[PDB]
Amino acid sequence: SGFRKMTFPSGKVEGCMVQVTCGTTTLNGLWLDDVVYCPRHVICTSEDMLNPNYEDLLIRKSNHNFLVQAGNVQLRVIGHSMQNCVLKLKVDTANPKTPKYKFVRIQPGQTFSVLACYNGSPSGVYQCAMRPNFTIKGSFLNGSCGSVGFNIDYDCVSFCYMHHMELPTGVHAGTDLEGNFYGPFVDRQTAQAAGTDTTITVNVLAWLYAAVINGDRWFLNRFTTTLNDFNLVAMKYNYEPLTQDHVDILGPLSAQTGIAVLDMCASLKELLQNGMNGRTILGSALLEDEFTPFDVVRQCSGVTFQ
Amino acid sequence: SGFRKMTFPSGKVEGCMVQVTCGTTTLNGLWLDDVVYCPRHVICTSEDMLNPNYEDLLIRKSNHNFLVQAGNVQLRVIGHSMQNCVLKLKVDTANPKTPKYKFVRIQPGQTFSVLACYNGSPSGVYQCAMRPNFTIKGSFLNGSCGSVGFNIDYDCVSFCYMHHMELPTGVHAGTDLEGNFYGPFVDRQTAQAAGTDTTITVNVLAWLYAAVINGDRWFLNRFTTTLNDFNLVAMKYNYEPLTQDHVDILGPLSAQTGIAVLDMCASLKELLQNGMNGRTILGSALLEDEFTPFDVVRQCSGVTFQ
């Protein structure tokens, strides 16, 4: 038993983390096959980031202006191109540790593991979720740009995130591995703010099902509610509107534990209107929304992926 | 910026995770050089665990009764021995992925990363702390035995934990890599209970310093307190007695932020006597005690270890 925030084994990703140097700037890159992917603002200095013409700045750069280091080994750059907000440095040697991988644009609410890196060296890994406002609440200091988010299914590494910037509000924004920013953020140093960050309701119900499996049952009420009435309460407390697809996704969690989805929605409705009354659930005094229904089934059933 | 629960990159440990089979039982083992370390209750069935004579059960076993699998490769066992609560299976081939490692018996309050495994396959990694009652609050299902805890400094893998059992209370107990159980627990299926689990006070103050660095300052009071008076309040709310060594360890956190340790102890005293009043600190409504003062300096300064 037990339930904690888990990340995928980051071994397959460490073998792809490189250091990219371009002028006075250095950040991390992702080395898959003979292409190194890195944020495109490595070609900017601190003064260019106010309003950089990336196409113009990229013209002044040649292949030999990109210093890619894989540990102690240096990869000779033989081609550079940019799509959206990412660079593609074609290198001469392919990564011998390239795992089976995909580039996946995840949807909001879904989670992934983040391998934080500095100077191409992995520094730690933590679990994060794609907030409804397309931000993530990771932890990134200077030099962490280029760190990737990913999910590990079977043996395939599903890359989904690349960190790009810290917003003035303290949260983080980035792109998929094709360079497309999640949300309406751009890779500039301007007044950027994220919208209303609501709560992923389907994740909260999955986290509540994991509580029942683990022994916490004080919240299981003696009431019920319909999907329409529950969504009325959800909008008052800034929760994502629950759809029937969410109810269908919570099917196995409902079948494993015996509490119907709408029955758990009433328990969540009671928690939104009465609070926790000083109690805790899975060691937390708040309602957690960064566990997808798959994340719970992973941990409450023991799925491996080596 | 940002602050989250972080684990060390588990890559160096995945290359050491093997599967050990002995009869109908299968759990995980740690393969360093030409020795595989695994829990000693792999030689027991479900009925032996009430009161197993491990020396007697180990006599009935020979080298060829131990089936060690490293992925698809099988390691031929050429020698078996047990020290305390761990087995040592001498194998013919040394692990080509053995990192620089140590066997370290950590002290309570210190943290480590746990790589959960099933059938020798890594399944996920989460950060945990050695509670004052020598338990850990991980997450372990059947087949997770043999999973290790570790810390990564520089390039050296400091192994410190090996999971052994789920207590009836739902928490977990284990040994160091020399087989010595943390705490008064034994590797049997008997009525075992952990003592009073108190709060690691020095960790809470470090987590409060990380809050100040990250922008949370609502708890920084206009009072102060002495070490004696604070320890009086700490014992009322079941907190570890703060020593001068703890104050000395919080030195750099005090110097980086400007709030003295005793000044922060008054803010913590106010939080113990008044609660959070509905507010949160670093996204938590409770007081976190699973961040060592080193864990904060790791994350608030960007220390890498590849």
Author numbering:
A (entry chain A), B (entry chain A): 1 to 306
Paper text:
SARS-CoV-2 Mpro is a cysteine protease that forms a dimer composed of two protomers. Each protomer comprises the chymotrypsin and 3C-like peptidase domains I and II (residues 10–99 and 100–182, respectively), with the active site consisting of a Cys145-His41 catalytic dyad located in the cleft between the two antiparallel-β-barrel domains. Mpro cleaves the polyproteins at 11 positions with a consensus cleavage sequence Leu Gln | (Ser, Ala, Gly) to release nsp’s, which are required to assemble the viral replication-transcription complex. In addition to the indispensable role in viral replication, SARS-CoV-2 Mpro also plays an essential role in escaping antiviral defense by cleaving host cell proteins.
Crystal structures of 11 Mpro mutants provided structural insight into their altered functionality. We employed crystallographic structural analysis together with a high fidelity FRET activity assay by our group to assess the functional and structural changes in Mpro mutants. The crystal structures of several variants revealed the changes in side chains orientations of residues in the active site comprising substrate binding pockets, especially S2 and S4, which might lead to altered amino acids preferences. Accordingly, changes in KM values for most of variants were observed, indicating alterations in a mode of substrate binding. We observe the highest level of conformational plasticity around the S2′ and S3′ binding pockets with N142 and S46 being the most flexible residues within the structures we solved. Also, we observed that the charge distribution in the active site changes quite dramatically even upon a single substitution especially around the S3′ and S2 binding pockets. This might explain why with most mutants we see the changes in binding affinities and not the kcat values.
